Symmetry: none
Subunit: 31 residues, 6 copies
Amino acid sequence: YEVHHQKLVFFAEDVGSNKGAIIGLMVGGVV
Amino acid sequence: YEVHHQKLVFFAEDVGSNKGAIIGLMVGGVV
Amino acid sequence: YEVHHQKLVFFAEDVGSNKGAIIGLMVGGVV
Amino acid sequence: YEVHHQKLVFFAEDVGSNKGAIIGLMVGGVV
Amino acid sequence: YEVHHQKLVFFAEDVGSNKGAIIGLMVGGVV
Amino acid sequence: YEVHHQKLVFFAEDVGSNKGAIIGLMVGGVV
């Protein structure tokens, strides 16, 4: 009543992100 | 009543982002 | 009543993210 | 007669794609 | 007669893909 | 007659994929 304070913090980071390497397939070579 | 304060913070970063490398396929060579 | 304080913090990080390496298949070579 | 008739096929599909839903954060209502 | 008739097939599908739902955080309501 | 007729098949599917649901945290309501 006399004193009322409210603090709300929402934080999200790195969701569904790719920092590495994604590859379907790789071949050294064909002979 | 006498004192009323409200603080709301929403923060989001790096969602569905690609900082690495994505490749379908790679081949050294064919002979 | 006289004094009222509320603090809420929500934090999430690294969800469904890939920092390593994902590959379907790899072959040294075919002869 | 030595060597002939070679057939090579490479196929890659759906790599690093998003068909679903990616959301950093969801909030109904506040106060 | 020596060596011929070679058939090679490479197939990769659905690598590092998201068909579901990825959410950093979900909140109904606050106060 | 020496050596011929070779058939090689490589198949990879659904690697590191998400068809379900991944959530960092879920909260109904607060106060």
